[PDB]
Amino acid sequence: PEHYIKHPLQNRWALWFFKNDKSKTWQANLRLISKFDTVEDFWALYNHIQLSSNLMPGCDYSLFKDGIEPMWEDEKNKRGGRWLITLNKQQRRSDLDRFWLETLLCLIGESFDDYSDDVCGAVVNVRAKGDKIAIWTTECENRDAVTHIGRVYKERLGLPPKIVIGYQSHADTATKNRFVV
């Protein structure tokens, strides 16, 4: 059995791609790439697609649990928010790809203990003004879950204890930090 069975992930995940096109609405620019629910199928997808650092400005990748669309309006995001990593322009070269892969692994390896159920997904925005990576969680009022996810995340990325990252609610974004670690 251990010799021929793929390793199932705790969740099935969906990878989404966004390309900025001014002809279309934001939602129409968002497309589902594919889904996977094993370790082997994750790496097959990851090894097939461009590194975030090679995407043209204006594109996003989003990895979300199957059934959760990567948008504020989803029932599992509308009360939620995001831990935000803001990258300067030089970090496109040094940190963007390594941080994004670490983020993908935090998701699929369920690295937030009994709070991994609060995780909805993650998003990388490739932007000329400065890239962004974020982990999206389901309820911005859940102080224990949000602060635990942020503390674990900051350490898995290896950010110096000097650096401060913020958590913002999607309701505020759509219309400040709620937490910092």
Swiss-Prot record:
Question: Record's superkingdom?
Answer: Eukaryota
Q: What is the effect of changing residue 26 to A?
A: Abolishes mRNA nuclear export. Impairs nuclear pore complex reprogramming. No effect on interaction with PML or viral Z protein but reduces binding to the mRNA cap. Capable of AKT1 activation. Does not impair interaction with HHEX or HOXA9
- Which GO molecular function annotations are given, in alphabetical order? DNA-binding transcription factor binding; enzyme binding; eukaryotic initiation factor 4G binding; mRNA cap binding; RNA 7-methylguanosine cap binding; translation initiation factor activity
Compartment(s): Cytoplasm, P-body; Cytoplasm; Cytoplasm, Stress granule; Nucleus
**Which residues hold mRNA?**
26-27, 72-73, 127-132
Keyword annotations of the record: Acetylation, Cytoplasm, Initiation factor, mRNA transport, Nucleus, Phosphoprotein, Protein biosynthesis, RNA-binding, Translation regulation, Transport
Annotated region described as EIF4EBP1/2/3 binding, given as residue ranges: 7-10, 43-47, 102-109
Q: Which Pfam families match?
A: IF4E
Give the free-text PTM comment from the record.
Phosphorylation increases the ability of the protein to bind to mRNA caps and to form the eIF4F complex. Phosphorylation also enhances its mRNA transport function.
Q: Does the keyword Flavoprotein apply?
A: no
Single biological process term from Gene Ontology: positive regulation of mitotic cell cycle
Where's it mainly located?
cytoplasm
Gene Ontology cellular component terms for the protein in this record:
chromatoid body; cytoplasm; cytoplasmic stress granule; cytosol; eukaryotic translation initiation factor 4F complex; glutamatergic synapse; nuclear body; nuclear speck
Q: What does this protein do?
A: Acts in the cytoplasm to initiate and regulate protein synthesis and is required in the nucleus for export of a subset of mRNAs from the nucleus to the cytoplasm which promotes processes such as RNA capping, processing and splicing. Component of the protein complex eIF4F, which is involved in the recognition of the mRNA cap, ATP-dependent unwinding of 5'-terminal secondary structure and recruitment of mRNA to the ribosome.
Quaternary structure annotation from Swiss-Prot or TrEMBL: eIF4F is a multi-subunit complex, the composition of which varies with external and internal environmental conditions. It is composed of at least EIF4A, EIF4E and EIF4G1/EIF4G3. EIF4E is also known to interact with other partners. Interacts with EIF4ENIF1/4E-T; promotes recruitment to P-bodies and import into the nucleus.
Similarity-based family: Belongs to the eukaryotic initiation factor 4E family.
Report the protein name in the record: Eukaryotic translation initiation factor 4E
Species whose genome carries this gene: Mus musculus
